[PDB]
Amino acid sequence: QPEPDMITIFIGTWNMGNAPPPKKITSWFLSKGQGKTRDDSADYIPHDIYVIGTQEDPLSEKEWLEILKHSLQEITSVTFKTVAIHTLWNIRIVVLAKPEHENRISHICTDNVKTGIANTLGNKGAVGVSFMFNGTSLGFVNSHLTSGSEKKLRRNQNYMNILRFLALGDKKLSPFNITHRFTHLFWFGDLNYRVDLPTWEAETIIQKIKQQQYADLLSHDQLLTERREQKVFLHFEEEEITFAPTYRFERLTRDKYAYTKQKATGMKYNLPSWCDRVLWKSYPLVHVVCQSYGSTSDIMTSDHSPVFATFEAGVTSQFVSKNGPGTVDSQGQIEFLRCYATLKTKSQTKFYLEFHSSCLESFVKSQEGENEEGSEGELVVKFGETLPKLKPIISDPEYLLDQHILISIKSSDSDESYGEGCIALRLEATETQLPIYTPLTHHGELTGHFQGEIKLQTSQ
Numbered sequence: 001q002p003e004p005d006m007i008t009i010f011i012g013t014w015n016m017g018n019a020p021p022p023k024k025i026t027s028w029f030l031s032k033g034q035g036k037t038r039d040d041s042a043d044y045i046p047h048d049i050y051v052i053g054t055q056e057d058p059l060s061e062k063e064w065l066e067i068l069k070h071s072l073q074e075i076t077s078v079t080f081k082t083v084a085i086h087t088l089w090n091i092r093i094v095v096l097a098k099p100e101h102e103n104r105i106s107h108i109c110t111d112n113v114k115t116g117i118a119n120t121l122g123n124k125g126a127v128g129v130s131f132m133f134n135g136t137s138l139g140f141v142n143s144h145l146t147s148g149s150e151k152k153l154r155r156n157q158n159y160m161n162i163l164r165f166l167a168l169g170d171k172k173l174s175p176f177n178i179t180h181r182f183t184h185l186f187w188f189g190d191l192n193y194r195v196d197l198p199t200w201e202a203e204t205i206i207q208k209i210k211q212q213q214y215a216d217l218l219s220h221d222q223l224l225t226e227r228r229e230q231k232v233f234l235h236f237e238e239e240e241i242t243f244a245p246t247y248r249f250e251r252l253t254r255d256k257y258a259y260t261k262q263k264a265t266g267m268k269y270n271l272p273s274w275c276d277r278v279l280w281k282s283y284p285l286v287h288v289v290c291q292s293y294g295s296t297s298d299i300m301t302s303d304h305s306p307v308f309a310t311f312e313a314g315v316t317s318q319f320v321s322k323n324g325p326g327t328v329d330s331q332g333q334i335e336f337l338r339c340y341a342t343l344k345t346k347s348q349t350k351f352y353l354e355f356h357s358s359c360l361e362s363f364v365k366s367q368e369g370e371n372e373e374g375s376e377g378e379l380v381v382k383f384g385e386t387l388p389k390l391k392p393i394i395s396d397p398e399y400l401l402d403q404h405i406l407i408s409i410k411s412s413d414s415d416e417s418y419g420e421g422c423i424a425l426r427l428e429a430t431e432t433q434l435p436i437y438t439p440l441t442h443h444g445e446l447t448g449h450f451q452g453e454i455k456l457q458t459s460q
């Protein structure tokens with residue numbers, strides 16, 4: 001029974017509007033409705049993993065698990081195993097997997113983050129799940145961000161709090177937040193970014209939606225504009241949106257957008273918006289392909305429509321050799337040549353690097369670099385040919401070329417990371433000096449760059 005090198009992952013996000021679901025929700029899990037939809041010929045083919053995020057979920061965990069599992073069994077004739085379920089207030093994440101995957105899944109973690117302070121603490125935040133699928137780490141975040149058209153900055157702040165404080169994946173990766181801990185990270189939810197057009201244009205926007213003409217609406221979507229200005233979700237991907245805004249509908253039909261201000265809305269307008277989103281970030285040169293991204297048309301209990309996204313995702317096997325795990329393999333080495341970090345910091349400590357990777361027995365600290373001044377004001381930290389030779393546990397190129405090195409640049413004075421990045425070992429050649437590059441971030445914001453050359457020796 002061979003180990004897979006690809007899986008498919010279903011991601012769902014639905015703000016249920018505090019109402020029970022209708023009796024049939026199968027269109028959601030089938031990626032049917034509007035947008036990039038799944039071929040009818042695939043309807044009986046189960047996804048390997050289903051990750052369901054809800055917001056404003058009124059159900060108990062048990063109630064929702066029974067609906068989800070019975071839905072999937074009706075579609076696929078497979079009884080899915082529950083990997084994890086975690087709820088914060090009315091924000092929930094469920095992970096289901098095909099039974100064949102039970103002994104491929106391990107290291108399951110769950111956590112939550114509550115956003116805001118006093119007034120603004122009490123219903124917004126995020127839940128998440130991580131686990132290993134054979135040799136591949138997977139992370140999943142369902143967030144319900146702050147609502148309201150004039151709170152895009154609060155949403156951006158909610159995002160940074162969630163990525164700083166959500167404790168998922170390998171705790172030994174101490175310098176790294178969730179945006180670096182996983183081979184594949186999926187971040188979805190009621191992100192609550194709005195189409196930023198004047199209130200007076202509500203009926204114009206509705207007209208455009210009825211004509212399926214989204215371009216002049218998407219050019220005002222706050223999440224796209226904030227992402228293009230590097231204010232949020234730096235280094236994440238999103239499929240092109242080709243479905244109608246998923247909020248705010250009159251319940252029990254999809255024929256009407258309910259946008260006008262009401263006491264129940266705090267006297268706020270809810271112009272039609274793409275509140276409900278799926279984004280991802282995968283390590284460099286790992287296979288990830290979005291195969292659906294859309295909304296259902298036939299689930300109408302909520303003022304939001306459910307959103308689906310599906311992905312092909314590359315996975316690796318749990319590799320054993322005669323040597324590692326449990327020792328090094330002397331036929332393997334990773335060398336860094338001519339490396340330097342460019343940092344945006346105004347500070348003047350010395351810096352050292354840490355290299356973290358599950359291809360090493362443990363993380364490696366470098367010597368301090370040599371600080372120089374860049375021609376445009378920058379700090380340049382030079383490592384030269386001084387970096388420690390990395391000793392991987394396994395030399396086989398079928399393993400090593402699929403690995404990644406996480407890099408943190410840390411202050412000698414404080415041992416605090418000033419920037420984190422990731423280098424793929426999926427090189428064009430071995431035993432050959434090749435350029436490498438990663439941007440460096442801290443708290444998910446750009447703090448600099450790391451570049452140089454690599455020389456990878458495998459057993460071949």
Ligand SMILES: O=C(Nc1cccc(Cl)c1)C(F)(F)F
Nearest residue numbers: 081082083084097101102105
């Ligand atoms: O641990 C659970 N599930 C689980 C564990 C390992 C593999 C798989 Cl497939 C599922 C829980 F939370 F449901 F009890």
